[PDB]
């Protein structure tokens, strides 16, 4: 199936003293494999998945050097942006950046990304054609004009379509035992009497990967959204994910309700029903 590689960067200014707090993380699909925290002792890009530990010294040296360069750019940006928005030097602000590439089911470049945010809102983003920019306001417009003149889009395009895809393919092969394996959700249902006449049926989906999944409730073969509750997909902590959906029903009529589970790891959707 399709796969992706993404890098997330966050820098928070600390006006009271010192430089911004900078944190960077790298992911392949829903698996984190590297990180950098300016607050940590190593001051180096660090591994977070076993399959990336195969890389030699030159890899870690280059990645460390580059992530530090990323850090400084963000430090400068915080200053530049404080001026663009005419803000005080006494408050703390945030800049975020995210970029990456996707390969399709054919394993060929599918698409690339490069977006930026200031204080949690879109600032500037590269469009899908990887040739134009989307600026959210006049501060971003100034940046856009400068990046057009410096041809930053062309440079990012060469990375996203080349280096990015090539490395994503390399990581996929090296960590194939996990990255190219889908973990079908382990499902079951629980029954909870909320009163003498009503009961809650909760449909569980556990230990699945990737995170993408859909849980739906039907009553007498027809989708039901009322009297239901769906929680946000959450990380188990061991690399897999969890989710559940519940419905309140009249005691004694549990048999009319079915929970439908769709996930890439299942040849066909599963259907659960209570006793």
């Amino acid at each position: 199936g399709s796969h992706s590689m993404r890098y997330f960067f966050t820098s928070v200014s600390r006006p009271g003293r010192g430089e911004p707090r900078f944190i960077a993380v790298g992911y392949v699909d829903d698996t984190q494999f590297v990180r950098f925290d300016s607050d940590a002792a190593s001051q180096r890009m660090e591994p977070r998945a076993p399959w990336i530990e195969q890389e030699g010294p030159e890899y870690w040296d280059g990645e460390t050097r580059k992530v530090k360069a990323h850090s400084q750019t963000h430090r400068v940006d915080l200053g530049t942006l404080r001026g663009y928005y005419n803000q005080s030097e006494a408050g703390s602000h945030t800049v975020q950046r995210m970029y990456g590439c996707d390969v399709g089911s054919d394993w060929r470049f599918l698409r690339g990304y490069h977006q930026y945010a200031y204080d949690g809102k879109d600032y500037i983003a590269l469009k899908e054609d990887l040739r134009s920019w989307t600026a959210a306001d006049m501060a971003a417009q100034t940046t856009k004009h400068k990046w057009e003149a410096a041809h930053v889009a062309e440079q990012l395009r060469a990375y996203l379509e080349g280096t990015c895809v090539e490395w994503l393919r390399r990581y996929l092969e090296n960590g194939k035992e996990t990255l190219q394996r889908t973990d079908a959700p382990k499902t079951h249902m629980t029954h909870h009497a909320v009163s003498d006449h009503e009961a809650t049926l909760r449909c569980w989906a556990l230990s699945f990967y990737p995170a993408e999944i859909t849980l739906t409730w039907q009553r007498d073969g027809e989708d039901q959204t009322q009297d239901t509750e769906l929680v946000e997909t959450r990380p188990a902590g061991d690399g897999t994910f969890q989710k559940w959906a519940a419905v309140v029903v009249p005691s004694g009529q549990e048999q009319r309700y079915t929970c439908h589970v769709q996930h890439e790891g299942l040849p066909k959707p599963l259907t659960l029903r209570w006793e």
Partner: peptide, 9 residues
């Protein structure tokens, strides 16, 4: 692998 160049805003 990370990009090699990062232009300022």
């Amino acid at each position: 692998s990370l990009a090699n160049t990062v232009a300022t805003l």
